[PDB]
Design a protein around this nucleic acid. Sequence first.
RNA 1: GCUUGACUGCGAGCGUGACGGCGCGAGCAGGUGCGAAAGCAGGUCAUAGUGAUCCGGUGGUUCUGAAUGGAAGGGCCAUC
RNA 2: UGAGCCUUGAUGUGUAGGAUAGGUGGGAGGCUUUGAAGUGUGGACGCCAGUCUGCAUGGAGCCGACCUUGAAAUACCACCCUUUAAUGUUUGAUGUUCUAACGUUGACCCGUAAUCCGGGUUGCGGACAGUGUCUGGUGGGUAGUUUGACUGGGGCGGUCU
RNA 3: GUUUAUUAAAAACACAGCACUGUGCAAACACGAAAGUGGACGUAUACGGUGUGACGCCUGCCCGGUGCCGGAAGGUUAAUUGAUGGGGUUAGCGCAAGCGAAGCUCUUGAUCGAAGCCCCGGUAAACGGCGGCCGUAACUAUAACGGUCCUAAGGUAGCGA
RNA 4: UUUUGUAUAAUGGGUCAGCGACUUAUAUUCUGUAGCAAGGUUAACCGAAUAGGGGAGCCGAAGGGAAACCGAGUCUUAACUGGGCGUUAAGUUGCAGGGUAUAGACCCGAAACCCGGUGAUCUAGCCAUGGGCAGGUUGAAGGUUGGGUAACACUAACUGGAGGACCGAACCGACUAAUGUUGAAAAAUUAGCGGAUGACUUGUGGCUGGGGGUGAAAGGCCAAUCAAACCGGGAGAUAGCU
RNA 5: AGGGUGACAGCCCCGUACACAAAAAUGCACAUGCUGUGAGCUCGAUGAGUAGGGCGGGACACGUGGUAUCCUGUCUGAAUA
RNA 6: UAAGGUGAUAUGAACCGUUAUAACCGGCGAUUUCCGAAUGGGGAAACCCAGUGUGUUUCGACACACUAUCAUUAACUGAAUCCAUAGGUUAAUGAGGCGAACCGGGGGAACUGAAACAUCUAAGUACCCCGAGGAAAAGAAAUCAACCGAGAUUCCCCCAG
Lengths: 50, 77
Amino acid sequence: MQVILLDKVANLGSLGDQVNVKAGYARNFLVPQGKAVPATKKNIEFFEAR
Amino acid sequence: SRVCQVTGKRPVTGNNRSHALNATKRRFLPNLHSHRFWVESEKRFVTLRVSAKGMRVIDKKGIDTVLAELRARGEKY
RNA sequence: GCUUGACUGCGAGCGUGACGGCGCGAGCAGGUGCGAAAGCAGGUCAUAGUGAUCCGGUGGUUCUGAAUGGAAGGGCCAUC
RNA sequence: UGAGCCUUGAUGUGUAGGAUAGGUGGGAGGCUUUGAAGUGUGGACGCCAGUCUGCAUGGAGCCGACCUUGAAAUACCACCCUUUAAUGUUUGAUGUUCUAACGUUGACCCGUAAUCCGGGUUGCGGACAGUGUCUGGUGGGUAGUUUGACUGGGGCGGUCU
RNA sequence: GUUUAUUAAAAACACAGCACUGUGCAAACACGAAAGUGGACGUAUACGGUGUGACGCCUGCCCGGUGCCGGAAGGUUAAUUGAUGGGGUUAGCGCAAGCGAAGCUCUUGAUCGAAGCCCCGGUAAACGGCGGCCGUAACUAUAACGGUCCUAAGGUAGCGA
RNA sequence: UUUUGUAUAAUGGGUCAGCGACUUAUAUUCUGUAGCAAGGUUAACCGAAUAGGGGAGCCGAAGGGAAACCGAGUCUUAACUGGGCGUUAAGUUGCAGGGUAUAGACCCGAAACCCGGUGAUCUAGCCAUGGGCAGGUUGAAGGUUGGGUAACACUAACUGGAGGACCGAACCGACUAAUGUUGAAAAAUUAGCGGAUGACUUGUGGCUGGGGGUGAAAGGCCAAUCAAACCGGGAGAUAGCU
RNA sequence: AGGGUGACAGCCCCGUACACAAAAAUGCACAUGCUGUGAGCUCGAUGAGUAGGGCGGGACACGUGGUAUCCUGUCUGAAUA
RNA sequence: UAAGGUGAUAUGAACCGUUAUAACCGGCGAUUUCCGAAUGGGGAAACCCAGUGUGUUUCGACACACUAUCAUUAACUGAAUCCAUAGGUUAAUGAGGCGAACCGGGGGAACUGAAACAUCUAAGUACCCCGAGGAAAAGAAAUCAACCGAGAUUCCCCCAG
């Protein structure tokens, strides 16, 4: 879905991008291993402040 | 048991309505899967008996918010 | 030869069935066909050529229209 | 590799005709020294009929009802249709590789002097397998039932309006 | 040897043997909603199913039908995908005859689409089939033999009174 | 009792006494009776509790048509000389009874179906641990020596003791006949008969449960029973039958 | 009221109507004390894998029918006075 | 409260008491063997076999006390693995079981009726299972109504076969 990147990711990422990703590549790789977070419109200001 | 741990969904019964409307009893099994989840707060691979809808709920609420609901009703995980 | 009465709305009275029904019917109202006219024609000389109901299909009729204005559906007439 | 979508470029031989005219709109001046016609080639399309354009010679012009066409302009400016090509996005299909879901009735460590199970490491498979829902075929393995009546008893034959 | 305890002890059942087929182990198969177990702490010289029933001589012909095994260009084909078309409603426009935007909604279901079936090829120690009709020729007369019937093929060996 | 018809040799009763079968609840219609009368009448509830209060509501004095609608008329049709249905007949509430409806519905009686439990101390198969098979006979493989062979073969005694082997008690089974048939016995006795070192038999304990088990296969067995055990429940199943 | 006493009892007896009683335990009432709980006013905030939809069912008298509403096994999926 | 009394079959025997400690009845206690949720482990229920702690004018043997499982909380220890968790020990509190009906919820037939029977009916009935209470359940409107309004839920009578 709408996850935002956080790292030195390959060629879809620029340290934070709103992309259209699938659910299976979202969880177990990008959810809790690091590097992403689901964009529930509360975290879009919270981690950009970080 | 075939009970979803997150959403509490349990198998219900039904009928196989044919072309001649003959009633035959059967069950409605959920799309349950034993998925291994990772948490940041406890640093542990936590396996949970969840459904296909249960995976959809746990993505929006979060991996740690659902465990607060299992904490409140005394479930084990 | 000319033609659409193989008309529509009705119908006193009667035959015939346990019933559902079926069969005959002068006459009236409307509009016709034929004959100059009186008149005759509501199918075939008559009696066999048939199927109830339910659920629906089609056309017409605003008849009904679960707040109102419609509509869906139902009903009635024709018909499968 | 099949499709849409977005810029970017090509693309249109009924026939008379200065000539391989896409249609509607504004439209009698735009463009050229922010260097033009007209000649000379490379790449290229293709019904080899011709055309576009980089480079370059060139060194100051070409146009419009022009007469013809069922419809007039490479005079310019617009949104575009026909067909076609290459980048770029999007959605599917096919094939390869890979790991992180998932499988492990391979190995090892610990709970634990424990053949289960749970946790961890690692190997091998791997988005297959299998499961859930929906759905086509198969299915006496099983379940509920049906298989008519008159009839010189029943059956055979025959009949039912 | 076994069996109808309690009317049938056998020509029945079983039997080693033979043959077919399934099965590469987390096996096929089976008990179980499942877990798990049996199979088996076994590994195709093994296991499960099926028919036949020591041994000796042997086991012919026929794949059309029905089953199974594959093969697949096409036909047909579910869920799904919702392309078009029709209808209702009304902002507006028409003194009205009516028409009808957007949105919502009813309905219609082109295209996509697997196995199966049709189709194509095998398989009889698969279920099964192994037939008629006419014409002769030593004493009855055979059916050697000769035509036909294309439904796939018309009794081989051995036995029979 | 049932029949066209019973002394019927058609069914039923040994006798006596007790017991035993057209009910009840709620609705509706009809009749009788009683009250009021174009009106009649309450239900729950309240309650000075069978009074009284309560008129929610039901039924009747108006019908016709599918209906809108119209109305002593209405429908049918363009409209009916008409026609169909109505107007010109007092109902209503109790009580008793004759019926019907729903309930088991006059009483007794099925074979079976379904659910929840109980049983492998009998029997079928299996698992674990133990036991039993008197006596006699046939004399396999192997072994040794001699004969025999060019060398094996082959053969002779001796040795050895194999067998779902032979005969025959215990034990297990039940082929034939008699007795037995309200038996001594709800399958037995006597005399013959089969197996009897095996696919045997047996004690004790364990496992497999009903649409299931097990079955060297009879559709047998699963507590004197099995073409689906037993018990309890739905259940007063149902019966157009006696 | 009723029962008994040698056959049928208002006056024989137990009782009956009526009039009374609780050391102790306990029920229900009010009154007060104690410790927590929370009042009243103003200003807000508004319950998302949820409503709804496809397929497959179930429940509403209503059997999918033109079928509203409610529940959901499956697959998805809003708006924010 | 009392002049009688030691329950009954059931007498008899031996006694008690008569002016307040005979008996009878009521409240509160004491005792309460063994089995049974059975709870120290087992068990063919009324039996067997222990652990820890404590006690002897007789420190042998016996007697006294405690020791189930699960849930929460707290303390102490404690792996693979560094932290950390899993796990282990101990303590406090609570739960367990029985019981006739009623209530809610999870599952859920068939006979029969349809003059057969499959949709249907029987019927969410019987039964099974779980949970709770003196009642339970439901309960303050995303409810009805129709342009007037009503104002949670439950129960009864009508509407109405």
